[PDB]
Design a binder for these strands. Sequence first.
DNA 1: AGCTAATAAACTAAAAACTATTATTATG
DNA 2: TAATAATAGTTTTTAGTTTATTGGGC
Lengths: 163, 246, 507
Amino acid sequence: IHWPCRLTIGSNLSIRIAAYKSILQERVKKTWTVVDAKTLKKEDIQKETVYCLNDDDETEVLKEDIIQGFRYGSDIVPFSKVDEEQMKYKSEGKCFSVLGFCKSSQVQRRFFMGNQVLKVFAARDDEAAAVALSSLIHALDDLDMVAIVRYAYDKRANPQVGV
Amino acid sequence: KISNIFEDVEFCVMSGTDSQPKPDLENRIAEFGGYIVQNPGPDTYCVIAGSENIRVKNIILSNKHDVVKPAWLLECFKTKSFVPWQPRFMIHMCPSTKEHFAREYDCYGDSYFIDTDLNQLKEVFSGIKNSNEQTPEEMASLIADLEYRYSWDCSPLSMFRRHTVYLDSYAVINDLSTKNEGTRLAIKALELRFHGAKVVSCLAEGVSHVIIGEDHSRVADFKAFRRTFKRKFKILKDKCELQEEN
Amino acid sequence: YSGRDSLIFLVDASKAMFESQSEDELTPFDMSIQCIQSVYISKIISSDRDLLAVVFYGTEKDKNSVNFKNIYVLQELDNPGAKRILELDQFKGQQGQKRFQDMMGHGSDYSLSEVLWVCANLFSDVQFKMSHKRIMLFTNEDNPHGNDSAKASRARTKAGDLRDTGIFLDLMHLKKPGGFDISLFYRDIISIAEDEDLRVHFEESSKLEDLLRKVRAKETRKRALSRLKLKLNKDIVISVGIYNLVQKALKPPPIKLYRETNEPVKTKTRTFNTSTGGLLLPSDTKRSQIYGSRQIILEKEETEELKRFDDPGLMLMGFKPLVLLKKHHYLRPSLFVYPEESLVIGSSTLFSALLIKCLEKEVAALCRYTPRRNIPPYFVALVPQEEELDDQKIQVTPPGFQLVFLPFADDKRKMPFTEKIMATPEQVGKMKAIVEKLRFTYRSDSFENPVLQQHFRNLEALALDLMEPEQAVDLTLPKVEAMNKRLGSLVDEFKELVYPPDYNPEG
DNA sequence: AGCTAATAAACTAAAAACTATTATTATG
DNA sequence: TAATAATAGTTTTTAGTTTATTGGGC
C-alpha cells in the first residue's frame, strides 16, 4: 500500500507523492493463544492482574485509583495522562517536508535508522509530478547531493528526520 | 477533630506553598479532621491551591474541581466553620459550581439575598477593568436616567458634566475652533468639567434655558440670537454663578 | 564502568561576590548559582546517578563536621534532586541573595587548607567506585591567601598533597575589574594538565558558556554488547566485542504510582481458571494456533527449538567487493565489531591483519551471525572502517568493522511501478541552480528530536513547578521564508516549465 | 449521507551483560 | 584448619503482544 502525501518545499511547492515500504522485516502475524492444558480451550484462560498495595499491606488498587509517574533523579514525579496529552508535543498531522541538501559523502551507511526502506514515487494521475521528480532525480545524481527531509506519519505518530 | 464538619469531606491539598508553608497548613487541616488527598479525585470536594503551579494550570484546564485559595480555608479555621463560597478565593471551578455561584450570586460578587456593604461593592468594582469606550452623551443620558428614575436628584455638585443646562463659553459664536483669552471664558471652560450639568455650546432649536455667562458684553449676541428662536431671553435673578433655568 | 563521577562547588562567601560593575551584570554569586542550577538540571537528565555537593567558605558561620570557622557546608555528595534545586533557587536572585545574607553570613577570614580538609573528608565519606574527583570553585581573586605567607605555604602544601591523592580541581574566572591575576597565586598551585594563562582576565572569560548550556541525553557508558566469536571454519575462532555507536534512545518508561500516597504500587499478575474461578499454573499452559479448523498445540521449549539453528556466534561465509552491496538495501541500524584479547589471545593481531588486507582488497566480509541462543542466524557484511583522526588527532571514526546487515528475499517488497520519464536538461539546470540556492553542509550533531525535548521541558517544568513550561525549539522546521527569499522567482519559473500553467499541483 | 484496517506506540516479558560476592577444597 | 572458585544481584536492551488508531465504502 502507498503512502498518499504531498512533499512540501518552502511555502509554494507541493508534489503529491506515494511512498511504498520497499523493505519490510519478516515477522509472523499468527500469535500463540494459550489454551487449557486439559480442555485445550482459551475460554477458561484469562489473566488476573492485581494492584495490591506495595506498602505494608496487600489491598488491590483500582485502575482509576492508580496513576503513572516518572523517575526524576533521586525521586519520582507523580504524573497523570491528561497532563502529558495536553502538554505533549503536537505534531502537525500527516506531513513530509525537505529540510536541506548536502553532499552524499557527508553521510555514511552507519547512520541509517529505522527498520524499513521507503521507495517513493509521485501520487497516481500526476504526470507533471512525474516529470518534476525525474528532474529532481537527475539533478541530485548530477550534483551528487542528498536531500535532508523531515517525516511525520500522522498526528499520533512521532515526527522524525530522514535522508 | 476540632470541627467535625471539615471532616468527612475530601480536600486536594496540593499547593499549600503560601506565606504559611504547606506542612503546617496540612497539620491544621488534620487538627480540624479535614480529609487530605494528594491527587484530585471525584470524591474530593475542592482542590487546595496556594501559590500557582503548572499542575495548578492543568487543574484550571481540568474542568473537574474547584480551585480554592488559602484565604478561604484560613478564615474557615479561624471561624472553626465553613466560610461561604463567595468568589474571592476562586480561580477555576466545576460547571456545577458555576451554576451554584450564578444562583447564589450574580455575574459578580453581588448577592441576591444578602444586603451589599462597602467591602463587597468595592471589591466587585475594583475587580472589573476600566470600561470607558462609550460616548460622553451616552454617559450624560445614563447618569440623568439614574438621577431622575431613582430619586437621586440630591447631588451637591452640578455645574457642567451631567444633564440639562445651557451656557455660552466662547466670545465668538458658531466658530468654536478658537479660544479668546484675556476674559472670563477660561473660568467658564474650567467650570464646564467637574460638578455636572450637560455642556451645550452650540446654538440650535433644542435649547430652552436662558443663562447669562460671566461676560456681560455677550448679552448683545444673546439678544441677536433670541429672535432666531421662539424662546425669549430673560434676565437672570448650588450654581455659584446666579443662573436660572426659567 | 570502571568508576563514577562527582563534583563539588565552592563559592566565596564574601562581598566581592555580591557586587556588580553594572546592573546589567549579575553578581558573581548570581551567575555562579544559576550556572549551578543549569549544571544540576543537566546532571539530573544526563547522569543523575552521580554525586554532587555544595560547600561555602568565607561566611561568618560554619557547618563542617570538624567545625572549621567560616566553612559552612550546604549540601553533601548525593544524587541531585529537585529539593536541592529549590534550596538553591530560594537564594538565587536579586533578593534571594539578600535573604541568604540575612539568614547566612558572608565575608570573613579563613584558610583554603581548611576547605581542602573538608572536601577531602567529604571524599572519604563516599564509598562507591569512583573515577573523577573533580573539584569546582568560583572567585575572581587569588592573592588574599597570599597575603599571609604561612597561609599560602600551607595552602600550596595541601594542594600538592591532594594532587598526589589524585584529586583534580578547576577554577572559573570571574569578572574582577582589576584582573583575576592569573599566574600570581593559583596556576602555580592549582592542578593543570596544560597552560593557557596569558591574560589576567579582567573579565569572567572561561567555560561558563558551556556549563550554563543545558544538555538533554543519557550518554550510556561503554558496555560491550557481547564478546561474541567468529567461527572461521569450525575451530579457528576469535573473540571480538560488539558495539552500537548509534543506539536509538526513547522516553523512559513511566512508573505506575498511587494518587494520595503516590506510592508505586506493585502489580501482581497471574491467571486463574475462568470456567471455575480457581487458579491456573504456568505448567498448566498450552499455546494454540488454529489455521482454519485444525488446532495445533505447542509448548515452551517446543517454541524454543524452532528458533534453534546454531550456537550464538559468527560464521564466516566469504568475501565480496564492497561495491557489490546496494546502498538502498537497508535492514535496520548497523552495528560495530571491535577485537579483544579477553578470551582469544592473539585475536587482535588477526583482526588487524584482516582489516589491513581487506582494506587493500576493497572487499566485504560475508558471515553468518547468531546474536544469542535460539535465534535464526542471518548473513551480514563487515565493512572495514579505518580509524580517522582530526586536527586534534581525536577519533572522528574508530577502527574496526562496521556491521551492516543483509536483508532476505522476504524483505523485498515490490510495488506497482511505472515507466521511465525523463526531463528537459534546462529544467535539470534550473534544479541545479535551485539546489545550489539552498545548499548547506550537513553535520550530525546539528539536529535533534524536538518531541523528546518538549517532554523534558515539561518534566523539569513540573519539577520546577513554574507558572509556565519551557518551550523547546524545533530545529527540523525548514526556514520557509528564508528559503523562499533565497530562491527567488526560479520556483515559479520551473513551475511553469514543468507543471501546466492552468493546472496547479494541487488536485 | 451511512460505513472501519494497517500501525507505530506502548507494553509487556525475557534474555544477556555486567558488576558486585562467596560454598569449596589443601592442610595442619 | 581458612583460600580459593561457580554464584547469583543490577541494569539493559530486545523481542514478542495490545491498542487506538484515518480512508472507503454506499
